[PDB]
Structure formats: structure tokens, C-alpha cells
Design a protein around this nucleic acid. Structure first.
Ligand SMILES: Nc1ncnc2c1ncn2[C@H]1CC[C@@H](COP(=O)(O)OP(=O)(O)OP(=O)(O)O)O1
Ligand SMILES: [Mg+2]
Ligand code: NA
Ligand code: NA
Ligand code: NA
Ligand code: NA
Length: 538
DNA sequence: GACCACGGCGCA
DNA sequence: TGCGCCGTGGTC
């Protein structure tokens, strides 16, 4: 059972970290298991040099830490990836363990033994599941290596810039805070939604609109505040206060404190088994939700910069989820729009909601986007009218004139739900699965909620599969050009390239992304270059 | 000190 | 539709 370090090749690794973040963790223990024997490493760090590959639960995490120490240790087989492909609700080692025959403990040796056992059991369950096997070998397993390099590389942050911006925003916050209190006739904690509720609906005469989900309090959400924007001067200042405090507390203040001492850069984690649809997630810190939609947000984007002598290259799949819907549904009108190379939102703004596409004003185009997104998420005419500043009836029509112009989308949604009810799951173009039991619920509200989750997954998940595949293909090509892949934001990639190669890099990555997997419609990629994330965007 | 539920909101 | 993080108001 107990055998001296080192282990034979192909052994499963087990390791304990002082904390969950690979880039910040002390490696406390390092074990390995193979053929019914466990090898525990006398000194974890030195023991790392003996390994040729990290095979086991949470492989990437160990690879990231290895890369941190200047070791080129790649992640290989990971039972978590197998489990997640079988059922995307398999997101943690704790859960996967109890489910497939072990216990996730806090000891390296037991973790190595667990990894071996779980892999054997899980690999057998993936026999016959050829499409999931293809996903594992061709996408998830290789992807884990790409992600490990991204995590270890990190991205550069203009700290002094954010420090200065912080002091600016702090001053503006105090003005709004002072005004709000003037209008309230007294100070209170403006960050407390409970105290705000009292002030708005009880102390001021403002009418409550909706209520909160769990506790049933009168909501003070943006949707509610926006509707009361001209019911009282205090509202506008509260909306602005919300924006500034959100951005300051979430990005401006925390980010500078997260710079790594060795790298001088910011290192997120790209979670590979975290979502029900097949998307990645980002945490510690989350870099897939850096602001950009507001002025202040854009000034925050500017903080993410290229290394000196380098440029950022930002690549973005144009309307990918819509293109994927065109393919999956086979709707002629939708397919023709993309094949003719037309702006789908502009076309959507003419095909319905009047005419003609020579064209529509910009405010009309966002109207079309709202509809499209709405269809994507199964948004009711209610929330659509509230999202469109138009009477409820005006929204109902807009939704109908949509399914008139793109009939096969309707047929596709109905077909997807029917098959989901029979099989108990839905799938992406590549066969990635999400089980959706509640399609058979006897409570309409629950059932319908489940339906929206169900038919959306094939779209969101196919777009995720495509991006993942693209990253897998793109990565080796960048390596050979001396370029870096830094971040992924669902439909977008951010790279780093030497100034002199930035053009060549952008051209190559663009073409690699557009040709990732030919569909019934072309994939168009928009690319931008700049010294910071904002100026690199379009 | 850590952790929780909630409402709220940042991004795709 | 899918995430992860914030402060509040709390518990332990
Ligand atoms: N405000 C919002 N609300 C909900 N979902 C949103 C969103 N913004 C984006 N998404 C979702 C849906 C799409 C995706 C981001 O795509 P783009 O925002 O770039 O819209 P695209 O289709 O490319 O039209 P373009 O104007 O760019 O031509 O994330
Ligand atoms: Mg876009
Ligand atoms: Na991992
Ligand atoms: Na139904
Ligand atoms: Na989606
Ligand atoms: Na090569």
C-alpha cells in the first residue's frame, strides 16, 4: 500500500493546498496512486519535479501552481471533467466523490487514491457515449492545459491609475450621499436596501412596484428605481449612487490589491466544471464581468493593459448565439441574413417593427437586439415591455411579428422541449448534455421556468463548445508566434502580442476562430488592437 | 475570524 | 439564459 516516492509514470496525483487559489496557494502535500499503491512525497515542492503530468482531480490547479514555480507540468486526465460531461451538475469533488464511489478528504494520499478509483469508475460510464468521449479528448482535456497557461500568465493592471480613479469616485460618491440625505431630511445607510425601502416607500410617499423573491420586501432594484426616475428627485441620485458604489467596491478598490508579487499581474481562475450549459466561469477575481457598458465602466476597462512593448488583441464572435440559433433551427430567413452578410439586428428591425433597412435609426436597432435576446432567454412580453419602455400590448405584438419572420425558431423551441421531456435532457450541437427534470412539473410557473432553461442551453452551450474548440486550436499557433492568450469572456478572447507581431497575430487568430467549425451560416469575428482593453475593443 | 441568505448588479 | 461578488444583517 505505502510505497516510497517517486511513483511510476501514469500515477494519479493527490495534493493539498493552503487555499483554493493555485496562484496564491502553499503546496502542503503531494501524493500519487497507481496499481493499489500510494506514494507520499517527503517534500512536496521538490517532488513536483518528478512528475511529467498532473493526472487526477483538479489537475489544472496543480498545473497552474507548477507553472508558477517555473515548471512546465501539464494537466492530463481529470475525473472532474468526465463527471461534468456525464452531468454538468457535477461541479465539485465533494459531490462527484459521494456519487461515484469515494470520499473527498483533506489528505493528499487519499485524494490520489480517490482520483484513480473515480477515474476507473467514470471512464467506464463513458463507454458508448462516443460524442461525450469526443468532447473529452478533443475539447475539455486539452482545454484544461490552455486554461492553466492563461491562469499562470495573468493580465497586467494599471494600479496607479485605479488608485487615482478611486479618489475621484470617492469624492463624487460623497456629493450624491450628501444630496440623498438632504432630500431624505436625515442621514441613513444608503448601502442598506432595507433602510432605503423604508425611506422611499414609508417616509417618502413613493409607490412600491414589485416585491423581492425570497422575503417579499418592497424591491428597490434598478428596474423599480428606473420606473420611479421622475416620481422624485432623490431617485436619480440613488441610481447614480448605486452605479458608482458598485463599480468602486467591486473593481476599482479590490483589483489593485490582488496583484501577484512575483508576476506583477492579475491572475483569475477559469473554472471548467461550473456551469449547467458548458460555459466557463471566472473567479478570484472574476474577470469575465469587468465593466464596459457605462462611462465609468469604460474608464475601468482602461486599467487592463498590455505589457510594455506589447499590445492587446481583442477578438469577438459577432452575434454568435444568434448564428448558432440559425444553424440549430434551420430558419431560412435567419440563415439568409448571415449568409448575405447583413446586420441581423438591423434586418430584424425592418423585418418587423416597420421597415425598411436603408435603414433603421440606432435606437431602433437596440429595439431589435432586445427582442432577439428576449427570444434567446424566453423573456415574457411583460419584462420585454419593461425593458423596452413600451406598453405591454406593444411588446406582445413585437414578439409575435418575430416568430412570423423566423417561424422555424418556434418549431425548433417546441421540438427541443418535446425531446427534452422524453429523454430528460437537452444537448448542444456536439452532444453536450443538460438534464432538465422539471420539464414535467405540474406547477406551470416551475415548468415554464424549466422550459426557458431547457431550450436556451443548446444555444448557449453550442456557442461555448465552439469557443472552447477555437481556444484549443488557436493556442499552439500563438505559442509559435510568441504570443499569449490572456482571457476568455464567453464570446470574446483577449490576447497579448509583441507590438511588431500584433497585426499578424490578429489576422491569424481571427481566421482560426471563424473556421473553427463550419456551420450553415458563417461565423464573423470582430478584432481590435490597443494598449489597453478599452482601446482594443470596438 | 468564518460563514450564511438575500437583494442587487457587473458581464456575456 | 448563464455566472460570481458586493454590503447588509445576521449567526457561530
Ligand atoms: N444588456 C444585455 N442584457 C442581456 N443580455 C445581453 C446584454 N448584452 C449582451 N447580452 C448577451 C446576448 C449577446 C451577448 C453579447 O453580444 P453583444 O452585446 O455584442 O450583442 P450582439 O448580438 O453581438 O450585437 P451587436 O450589438 O454586438 O452587433 O451577451
Ligand atoms: Mg458584439
Ligand atoms: Na481545476
Ligand atoms: Na408547457
Ligand atoms: Na444565452
Ligand atoms: Na508547432
Amino acid at each position: 500500500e505505502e510505497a516510497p516516492w517517486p511513483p511510476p509514470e501514469g500515477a494519479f496525483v493527490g495534493f493539498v493546498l493552503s487555499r483554493k487559489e493555485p496562484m496564491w496557494a502553499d503546496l502542503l502535500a503531494l501524493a500519487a496512486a497507481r496499481g493499489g499503491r500510494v506514494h507520499r512525497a517527503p517534500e512536496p515542492y521538490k517532488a513536483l519535479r518528478d512528475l511529467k503530468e498532473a493526472r487526477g482531480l483538479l489537475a489544472k490547479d496543480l498545473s497552474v501552481l507548477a507553472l508558477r514555480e517555473g515548471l512546465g507540468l501539464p494537466p492530463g486526465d481529470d475525473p472532474m471533467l468526465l463527471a461534468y460531461l456525464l452531468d454538468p451538475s457535477n461541479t465539485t469533488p465533494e459531490g462527484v466523490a459521494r456519487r461515484y464511489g469515494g470520499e473527498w478528504t483533506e489528505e493528499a494520499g487519499e485524494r490520489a487514491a480517490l482520483s484513480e478509483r473515480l477515474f476507473a469508475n467514470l471512464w467506464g460510464r463513458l463507454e458508448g457515449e462516443e460524442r461525450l468521449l469526443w468532447l473529452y479528448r478533443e475539447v475539455e482535456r486539452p482545454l484544461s492545459a490552455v486554461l492553466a497557461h492563461m491562469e499562470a500568465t495573468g493580465v497586467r493592471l494599471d494600479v496607479a491609475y485605479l488608485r487615482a480613479l478611486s479618489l475621484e469616485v470617492a469624492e463624487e460618491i460623497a456629493r450624491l450621499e450628501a444630496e440623498v440625505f438632504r432630500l431624505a431630511g436625515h442621514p441613513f445607510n444608503l448601502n442598506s436596501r432595507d433602510q432605503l425601502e423604508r425611506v422611499l416607500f414609508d417616509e417618502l410617499g413613493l409607490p412600491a412596484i414589485g416585491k423581492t423573491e425570497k422575503t417579499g420586501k418592497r424591491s428597490t432594484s434598478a428596474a423599480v428605481l428606473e420606473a420611479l426616475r421622475e416620481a422624485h428627485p432623490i431617485v436619480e441620485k440613488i441610481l447614480q449612487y448605486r452605479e458608482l458604489t458598485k463599480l468602486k467596491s467591486t473593481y476599482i478598490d479590490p483589483l489593485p490589491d490582488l496583484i501577484h508579487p512575483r508576476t506583477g499581474r492579475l491572475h483569475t481562475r477559469f473554472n471548467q466544471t461550473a456551469t449547467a450549459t458548458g460555459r466557463l466561469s471566472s473567479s478570484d477575481p472574476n474577470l469575465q464581468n469587468i465593466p464596459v457598458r457605462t462611462p465609468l465602466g469604460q474608464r475601468i476597462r482602461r486599467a487592463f493593459i498590455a505589457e510594455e512593448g506589447w499590445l492587446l488583441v481583442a477578438l469577438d464572435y459577432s452575434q454568435i448565439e444568434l448564428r448558432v440559433l440559425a444553424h440549430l433551427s434551420g430558419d431560412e430567413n435567419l440563415i439568409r441574413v448571415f449568409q448575405e452578410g447583413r446586420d441581423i439586428h438591423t434586418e430584424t428591425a425592418s423585418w418587423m417593427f416597420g421597415v425598411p433597412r436603408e435603414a433603421v435609426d440606432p435606437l431602433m436597432r437596440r429595439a431589435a437586439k432586445t427582442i432577439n435576446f428576449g427570444v434567446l432567454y424566453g423573456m415574457s412580453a411583460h419584462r420585454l415591455s419593461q425593458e423596452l419602455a413600451i406598453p405591454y400590448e406593444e411588446a406582445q405584438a413585437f414578439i409575435e411579428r418575430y416568430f412570423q419572420s423566423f417561424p422555424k425558431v418556434r418549431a425548433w423551441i417546441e421540438k427541443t422541449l418535446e425531446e427534452g421531456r422524453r429523454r430528460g435532457y437537452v444537448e448542444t450541437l456536439f452532444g453536450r448534455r443538460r438534464y432538465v427534470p422539471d420539464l414535467e412539473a405540474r406547477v406551470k410557473s416551475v415548468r415554464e421556468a424549466a422550459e426557458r432553461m431547457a431550450f436556451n442551453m443548446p444555444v448557449q452551450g453550442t456557442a461555448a463548445d465552439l469557443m472552447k474548440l477555437a481556444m484549443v486550436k488557436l493556442f499552439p499557433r500563438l505559442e509559435e508566434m510568441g504570443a499569449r492568450m490572456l482571457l476568455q469572456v464567453h464570446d470574446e478572447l483577449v490576447l497579448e502580442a509583441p507590438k511588431e507581431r500584433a497585426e499578424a497575430v490578429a489576422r491569424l487568430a481571427k481566421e482560426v476562430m471563424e473556421g473553427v467549425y463550419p456551420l450553415a451560416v458563417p461565423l464573423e469575428v470582430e478584432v481590435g488592437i490597443g494598449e489597453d482593453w478599452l482601446s482594443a475593443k470596438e
